[PDB]
């Protein structure tokens, strides 16, 4: 039939390393040794089989069955992906017909801690989820090709000849700081356990560079062992899940009020009796023991009524404009697999009820990433630096989306939300002035179910990082009792890790 045969073999390309921003390995192509066999040669050395089988960790008779059943094939795999050292002891047995191929297997040194961001490759070493998928072309490289001239009995007579070399993939350095990532991962997980919550997300970003410094979710999974992996655990919820932001968008409503020319911080709004009726609907505050609140007090008490009255006065168009311009419900440009854009509703003419509900964050849907980016722009004196999941060496120009004077005023109000009497004191960061806003969003007709939110930034004197904590369905639940302490603990550790000077460790009690 055939005197010879020409078999073609690909030379595997070394897949690009993924590191965090400091060069810590997050995805590594590690060398592995695959053993294959020519059964026609192996069948001439049967008395070596029990020793070979032992070296492979395989049952003597099952190994023998496998060879005998494939006795005519010129090629079977004995085992793929042993360690180089395990392969080295088998090669030393010098069994006829047993040969080795070096290939690579992806290893994820941080495991579940950064699994949602990094993703993973399939058995064919192709990116399937996360960054591995999004940057697959960058990471993959260009494999080579060999030619093997084989026998009529499958024995490779002519030594392989290399057609094309293997071109390695490119290194990729993420924006993530693995130190902050571990801190965020451990504090979110502990908070979930303490609160009996179903899921959660935590985003940390650099307000000055747009970099995503940490992005963790629960549940998570071990990418190095995906046996019994369930779909819910795979979700990078910070990017691919949407939620109503509720009270956490009130600083943007307040930004529109101050940009309107119609409102100044010392203005007061009468929110008594803690409710406001619009047709058949009643807007309700949680704490309903207030009458006059100034604009800062409306944020401290989180008065839906107060922000609603302001929204009626200034018009929803101005609030829509700020929310759109800080990115809520807008494409982020990151291109993360499955990333959601959410929804910021718009109208030619805004009905009165929807003007109020926009202003306190009902009925729009955002991602944790978007909410964090919005807070980063506010923290950065109103200038939005573009998002990045990769290390930023040369920072692109930002876009001024809130005037610096309005941004600075709203920043001070959010510092009061954390530090003033009656505010979110469990969000305070010891040694630092922190600023932010809690939220609690009921999942309407979705039976005693809520999300607890906190969004903020620090240090208030020169903001460095913005943070969003989302805790999904705690079993207690308020934003200020559930997500606020997580913000405090993670913000304190992250500021320390970044060597940020404390701006609230005075040694003297000053007066005023
Ligand atoms: C802002 O986010 C805003 N939230 C809402 O109006 C929305 N839902 O509100 C839910 C009620 O939320 C709370 C109730 C009670 C408390 C609280 N501190 N008191 C106790 C805590 C322990 C349990 N017993 C009560 C805190 C929050 C609701 O209506 O069920 C909302 C907006 S969009 C959407 N889908 N839902 C409020 C709650 C006014 N401010 O939020 S904040 O986090 O408290 O600052
Ligand atoms: Cl609190
Ligand atoms: Cl509601």
Numbering used by the authors: 48 to 493, 500 to 529, 532 to 567
Lines from the paper:
PBP3 consists of three major domains: the N-terminal transmembrane helix anchors the protein in the cell membrane, while the C-terminal transpeptidase domain (TPd) is the catalytic module of PBP3 and mediates cross-linking of PG chains by ω-peptide linkages between d-Ala and meso-diaminopimelic acid (m-DAP) residues on opposing peptide chains. The catalytic serine acting as a nucleophile in the transpeptidation mechanism is also able to react with β-lactam antibiotics because of their structural similarity with the d-Ala-d-Ala motif; the resulting covalent intermediate, however, has a very long half-life (with turn-over constant k3 ~ 10−4 M−1s−1 or less), effectively leading to irreversible inactivation. AiCuris previously reported on the development of a novel monobactam (AIC499), which shows remarkable inhibitory activity against PBPs of Gram-negative bacteria, and good antibacterial activity, even against clinical isolates harboring several β-lactamase classes.
In addition to the apo structures, PaPBP3ΔTM was produced and crystallized in the presence of AIC499; crystals belonged to space group P 21 21 21 with two copies per asymmetric unit and yielded diffraction data extending to a resolution of 1.7 Å. In the active site environment, the β3-β4 loop as well as the β5-α11 loop appear quite flexible, despite the presence of the ligand, as evidenced by high B-factors and often discontinuous electron density. Nevertheless, we note that strands β3 and β4 clearly bend towards the active site, supporting some interactions of their side chains with the AIC499 molecule, most importantly R489 (see below). More importantly, helix α11 is N-terminally extended by more than one turn in both chains, which again allows additional contacts with the ligand. The amino-thiazole (R4) is well stabilized, engaging in three hydrogen bonds with the side chain of E291 (specifically, one of its alternate conformations) and the backbone of R489. Unlike the situation in the EcPBP3ΔTM:AIC499 complex, the amino-thiazole does not form a parallel π-π stack with Y409 (equivalent to Y419 in EcPBP3) but a displaced T-stack.
